[PDB]
């Protein structure tokens, strides 16, 4: 019925008419030069899609996809390997036309068969959540350059997400299981190719100079550097010192003390290094500490509420962090879907049927993480923590909390990446000790952190909840019970309340008017159950770089736009 060259999850695509290049690029940007970047931890293989292993920097971008997303919109799709698509009004089937000029790096064509092969490969050797999400979906080459996708139930976002699948060359991947790590880079297709590396230490990408899609609208003014090099550092302090010394070119500064007090010295005086701070109005990544609620120590909501009360954010922000941070308080932070007011009538129609299985505060209060006076030793909050612990059966015997029936101490392990700056850890450990709670600290390397995060082999560990601009069907992978082993369910929660709210969200894909009370209602359930302990976020981007680059006039809303930068040989000439 319909045929289009652009798509959007909600509303209309911004570049629907006369699309020559994005607003946030310089179409005339020159090619050449190197950018060197840091990475924290280590890596051991090149397959981002395997069941295990520690994949190298940028290995999620080795392959082009059927459509690609703009960076100044939440979810709009524009042609890459595909030229266009025909589709049913409900998006339950689509026929994708493949660009006949599309090529892998060895010069061979990308065909409809490669896409069909790619879907079956993920279905049979991929991450276990893929065959669950696309249960009943088929992907079939119906012509040499036409792929037909059919969904067994309506899912406009699930359809559009298949446009982001990497398109694998069958001629290489027929000889490699998708679940196995790769010691060597696979045959690929994107604008940059791995050309050298040292296992665990560096990866070098080279610009593909005859890249078949270099002049497509989505690519104009992007992929300008001839070389992108990643050097690995074991902790962020030595990385920050290497940046100041000139060892790499660009730093995203996530430490408040570094920004407030350490952007000093010869290289800043002579303006060799540029420091930039821009406010950011869009959806925000948030930091949390995950409670593993499958372990007895964190199975009681009252214990999780009490440990949250012991986390003195106002003191940390004032005494340690130069008042730089804002407190995390939503799984839809800084969007319309955050539950920052009282439930309206539409939300109550969604929530009231489940009042038996909900904390009563969902209906009567706005969720607010604990606030202290910032002086330290908050009497009100620590008295309330004691009150909740006693009710849950953890009582003081001597100086240590002990189960009132068994007599087993209240004790747990905080699992920590050795690479992180963790100035907040000892203050939190001290506050818990004053409640009689023992928290052991275990710092481990990047490979053990990845292995144990995936298997949930922890009592508590830090987790980042990525920015979610609308209530996406991805939510089921992180929260719904059948996806408990996807590696994205940090607390280990299997709740029929969550499941019903997310099943309604998945049934309303692409329908904003109904996703709005659904998202706010889900936010209330996730926050009021204290599945995780809210830390902090900042709505500004703090960046610094050596002055060898120039940038477009406009920065994209949803990323920093580094792939639109270029090497400026006049500015570079002025550096030592």
């Amino acid at each position: 019925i319909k045929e289009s060259y652009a798509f959007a999850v909600l509303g209309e695509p911004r570049y629907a008419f006369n699309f020559n290049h994005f607003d946030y690029v310089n179409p005339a940007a020159p090619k050449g030069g190197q950018i060197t970047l840091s990475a924290l931890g280590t890596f051991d293989n090149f397959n981002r899609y395997a069941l295990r292993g520690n994949p190298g920097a940028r290995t999620e971008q080795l392959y082009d996809t059927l459509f690609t997303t703009s960076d100044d919109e939440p979810g709009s799709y524009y042609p890459l390997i595909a030229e266009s698509a025909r589709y049913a009004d409900d998006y339950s089937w689509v026929e994708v036309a493949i660009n006949p000029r599309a090529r892998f790096h060895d010069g061979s064509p990308i065909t409809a068969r490669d896409v069909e092969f790619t879907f079956q490969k993920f279905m049979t050797e991929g991450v276990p959540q893929f065959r669950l999400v696309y249960k009943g979906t088929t992907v079939k080459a119906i012509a040499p350059l036409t792929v037909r996708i059919e969904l067994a139930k309506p899912g406009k976002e699930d359809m559009l997400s298949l446009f982001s699948l990497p398109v694998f060359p069958e001629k290489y991947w027929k000889d490699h299981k998708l679940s196995d790590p790769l010691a060597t880079p696979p045959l690929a297709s994107g604008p940059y190719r791995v050309t050298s590396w040292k296992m665990g230490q560096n990866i070098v990408y080279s610009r593909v100079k005859d890249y078949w899609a270099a002049n497509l609208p989505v690519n104009r003014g992007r992929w300008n550097f001839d070389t992108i090099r990643y050097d690995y550092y074991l902790d962020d302090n030595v990385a920050f010192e290497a940046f100041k010394a000139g060892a790499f070119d660009l730093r995203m500064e996530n430490d408040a003390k570094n920004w407030a007090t350490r952007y000093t010295g010869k290289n800043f005086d002579k303006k060799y290094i540029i420091k930039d701070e821009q406010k950011n109005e869009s959806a925000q990544d948030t930091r949390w500490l995950a409670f593993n609620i499958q372990r007895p120590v964190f199975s009681d909501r009252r214990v999780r509420e009490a440990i949250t009360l012991a986390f003195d954010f106002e003191w940390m922000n004032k005494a340690l962090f130069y008042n730089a941070w804002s407190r995390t308080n939503s799984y839809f932070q800084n969007t319309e879907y955050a539950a920052r007011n009282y439930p309206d009538a539409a939300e109550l129609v969604l929530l009231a049927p489940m009042k038996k299985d909900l904390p009563s505060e969902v209906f009567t209060q706005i969720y607010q993480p604990p606030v202290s006076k910032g002086d330290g030793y908050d009497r009100d909050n620590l008295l309330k923590a004691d009150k909740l612990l006693n009710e849950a059966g953890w009582v003081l015997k001597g100086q240590q909390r002990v189960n009132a029936t068994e007599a087993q101490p209240l004790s747990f392990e905080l699992l920590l990446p050795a690479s992180s700056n963790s100035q907040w850890v000892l203050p939190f450990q001290h506050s818990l000790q004053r409640l009689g709670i023992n928290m052991d600290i275990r710092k481990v390397d990047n490979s053990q952190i990845t292995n144990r995060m995936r298997s949930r082999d922890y009592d508590m560990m830090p987790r980042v909840w990525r920015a979610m601009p609308w209530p996406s069907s991805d939510l089921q992978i992180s929260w719904s019970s059948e996806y408990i082993n996807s590696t994205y369910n940090a607390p280990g929660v299997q709740s029929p309340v969550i499941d019903s709210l997310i099943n309604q969200i998945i049934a309303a894909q692409g329908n904003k008017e109904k996703l709005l009370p659904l998202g706010r209602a889900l936010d209330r359930v996730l926050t009021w159950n204290y599945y995780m302990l809210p830390m902090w976020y900042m709505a500004e981007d703090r960046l610094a770089w050596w002055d060898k680059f120039s940038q477009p006039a406009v920065r994209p809303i949803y990323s920093l736009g580094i792939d639109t930068w270029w090497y400026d040989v006049n500015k570079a000439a002025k550096l030592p």
Binding site: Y49, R52, P55, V127, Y134, T450, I477, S486
Partner: peptide, 7 residues
């Protein structure tokens, strides 16, 4: 994420 494990 439907195509890869957490990192």
């Amino acid at each position: 994420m439907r195509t890869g494990n957490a990192x």
